[PDB]
Design a protein around this ligand. Sequence first.
Ligand SMILES: *[C@@H]1O[C@H](CO)[C@@H](O[C@@H]2O[C@H](CO)[C@@H](O[C@@H]3O[C@H](CO)[C@@H](O[C@H]4O[C@H](CO)[C@@H](O)[C@H](O)[C@@H]4O)[C@H](O)[C@@H]3O)[C@H](O)[C@H]2NC(C)=O)[C@H](O)[C@H]1NC(C)=O
Ligand code: HEM
Ligand SMILES: *[C@@H]1O[C@H](CO)[C@@H](O[C@@H]2O[C@H](CO)[C@@H](O[C@H]3O[C@H](CO)[C@@H](O)[C@H](O)[C@@H]3O)[C@H](O)[C@H]2NC(C)=O)[C@H](O)[C@H]1NC(C)=O
Ligand SMILES: *[C@@H]1O[C@H](CO)[C@@H](O[C@@H]2O[C@H](CO)[C@@H](O)[C@H](O)[C@H]2NC(C)=O)[C@H](O)[C@H]1NC(C)=O
Ligand SMILES: *[C@@H]1O[C@H](CO)[C@@H](O[C@@H]2O[C@H](CO)[C@@H](O)[C@H](O)[C@H]2NC(C)=O)[C@H](O)[C@H]1NC(C)=O
Ligand SMILES: [Ca+2]
Length: 583
Amino acid sequence: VKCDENSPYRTITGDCNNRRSPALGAANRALARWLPAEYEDGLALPFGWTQRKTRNGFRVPLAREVSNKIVGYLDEEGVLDQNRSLLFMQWGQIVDHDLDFAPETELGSNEHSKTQCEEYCIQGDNCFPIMFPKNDPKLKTQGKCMPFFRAGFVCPTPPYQSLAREQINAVTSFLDASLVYGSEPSLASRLRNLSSPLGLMAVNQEAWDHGLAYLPFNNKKPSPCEFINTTARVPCFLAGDFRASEQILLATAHTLLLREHNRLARELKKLNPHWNGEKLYQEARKILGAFIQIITFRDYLPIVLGSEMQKWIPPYQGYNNSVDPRISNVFTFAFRFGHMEVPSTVSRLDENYQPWGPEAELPLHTLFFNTWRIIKDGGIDPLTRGLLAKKSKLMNQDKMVTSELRNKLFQPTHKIHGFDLAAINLQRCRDHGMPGYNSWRGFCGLSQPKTLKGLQTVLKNKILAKKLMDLYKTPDNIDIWIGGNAEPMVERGRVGPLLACLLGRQFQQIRDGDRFWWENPGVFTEKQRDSLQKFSFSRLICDNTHITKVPLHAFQANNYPHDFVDCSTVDKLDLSPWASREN
Ligand SMILES: *[C@@H]1O[C@H](CO)[C@@H](O[C@@H]2O[C@H](CO)[C@@H](O[C@@H]3O[C@H](CO)[C@@H](O[C@H]4O[C@H](CO)[C@@H](O)[C@H](O)[C@@H]4O)[C@H](O)[C@@H]3O)[C@H](O)[C@H]2NC(C)=O)[C@H](O)[C@H]1NC(C)=O
Ligand code: HEM
Ligand SMILES: *[C@@H]1O[C@H](CO)[C@@H](O[C@@H]2O[C@H](CO)[C@@H](O[C@H]3O[C@H](CO)[C@@H](O)[C@H](O)[C@@H]3O)[C@H](O)[C@H]2NC(C)=O)[C@H](O)[C@H]1NC(C)=O
Ligand SMILES: *[C@@H]1O[C@H](CO)[C@@H](O[C@@H]2O[C@H](CO)[C@@H](O)[C@H](O)[C@H]2NC(C)=O)[C@H](O)[C@H]1NC(C)=O
Ligand SMILES: *[C@@H]1O[C@H](CO)[C@@H](O[C@@H]2O[C@H](CO)[C@@H](O)[C@H](O)[C@H]2NC(C)=O)[C@H](O)[C@H]1NC(C)=O
Ligand SMILES: [Ca+2]
């Protein structure tokens, strides 16, 4: 609404980052388009919508079928990443939720369409069902489809007619910890503790974790968290991002970062007793945002992109106001490579890092929107230790997405643990008008295979290639998500050539087009920056939990106790440079 022009703090909505073009990178604006949208009717209808209309002369294969033939597997053995901890997967979902969010279309609350899609699977308006192919076990037990609703679009929401359909991004594009503080002014206020001039975030008043805080409970019912265990009746958490409680390990990480804020706020009040509530809030919020960018750019990306890091994200050279900081519509699918790094089980470890109880290891599908396991079954220390001592799932061309997500995904709106995140992603690329695989290979200056043989050389897998061509008939029709994720991985990274390019650009753009990047001269002081350079996730753990043994590099596979050192050996964030002298 109004730019404070000389304020040292970002705005909640993301606006005013860029001075010439203020709304650039703000929340609730359209996702940027690196390539023109590709729709069946060229304006808004997705491919596969009208059964009869081909795409490049062929019918596009059912989402769920690509899922059955290509994406699934049975044997969970040998599937773990020998050199990436569970935190690797987990930090990616956080960076993701900070950068993008395409909410489904609403116009539903006392609607018979939410039921007309569920119940009868009739395609129409925003109901874009995922039909089950013949010979699918879910036909026998669930029905004929999986409800799916088209994502929201800008200008409107009601029917509409004008330009090409452009999806919304309900979050700020800048990597600014928006998932902790919120992207809307009204949500950001609700989240704060405006009862005490201490600038703290609100916490739970109904439950505590060893004197430590828990995220507040969401006031609104019906709550999906209460549904998964009608007896424990524990609601979902209230955070800066709506998906916070999507799965137990994500809500855990959310709790660690809320704790970090309040922790910084009370450490600041001590140094600068004179500062007011707004000042405390903003200054702590500014440090946390710097934390996300450091962990992400220093420790996280280098091991995702690998040898391709320098090629796409060169050394920083200053803020460049000509760079488009917005998240592209394709990034929101490229970053979903993370779905293939999610393992089937989640563990809880005790203080010696040994199983925690009878039921220490649990199926991933039992943890969706599961808040009672945290509150009523041990706190978050057992879960955090799991994130360090356990490994992520390694993407494997023969074993892409675990059945826990592939067949038992729980959707907050519906009542069953029977959705398919793989089919949903594929159905979502189409919903978003994504160009085919070769269109992106070309955008990244990569060869564009046209024959079966060609696809074998790119994928370096004869069988996978063969299945892809039987379903798609032409590499030009292959959906980006499954296309980019089937490529072999680059040296020392976790995604192939296409995915590296798409990720690389985005991250280099949101870092170079951010007026408030931490390394941006004038945003912090040389001394403040000297301090921040020491932030580490290991330390975040030491200061916000009761764990005392942690690894120096929490993202790699670490074995206990050999790789775990005592919290004393881990560098601290010296907040002294934030002391402000009067006269
Ligand atoms: C801030 O970010 C900006 C946005 O990306 C950057 O702007 C780029 O600025 C360059 C020029 O510095 C733009 O063009 C480049 O310059 C050459 C033309 O003068 C191009 O080379 C050749 O062009 C044709 C080939 O296409 C040849 O036939 C010809 O002989 C000439 O040699 C370069 O290849 C290059 O395009 C460029 O378009 C801008 N980037 C874009 C796409 O927006 C800028 O670098 C940044 N500013 C600073 C100072 O940091
Ligand atoms: C459950 C889910 C996860 C783990 C238990 C999980 C994990 C990740 C990781 C680890 C990612 C990156 C490293 C990542 C990226 C993005 N996802 Fe996924 N995710 C779970 C569940 C979902 C669901 C449900 C969606 C919505 C799918 C849809 O199309 O409707 C989802 C999405 C995305 C997403 C896009 C965001 C947007 O713009 O709205 C990523 C960038 N995830 N996830
Ligand atoms: C729904 O959530 C319930 C908790 O909110 C959960 O019940 C809990 O179940 C465990 C074991 O199943 C019990 O734990 C232990 O309790 C005593 C020790 O206090 C032991 O003697 C028992 O052997 C048991 O191991 C909890 O006491 C119990 N909580 C209560 C009060 O009911 C259910 O298991 C959850 N059900 C579903 C469907 O998820
Ligand atoms: C496990 O992963 C880590 C990180 O990917 C590897 O260690 C890094 O190796 C590079 C060499 O290119 C060093 O420059 C870094 O210093 C290492 N990271 C740190 C902080 O030590 C490690 O080699 C991997 N183990 C195996 C067997 O590949
Ligand atoms: C807002 O912050 C104040 C801290 O000043 C919280 O009040 C304290 O709450 C703790 C834990 O319930 C008690 O030990 C103290 O007695 C309270 N101190 C004072 C001076 O009030 C308050 O709970 C916070 N509110 C929310 C919603 O988080
Ligand atoms: Ca953000």
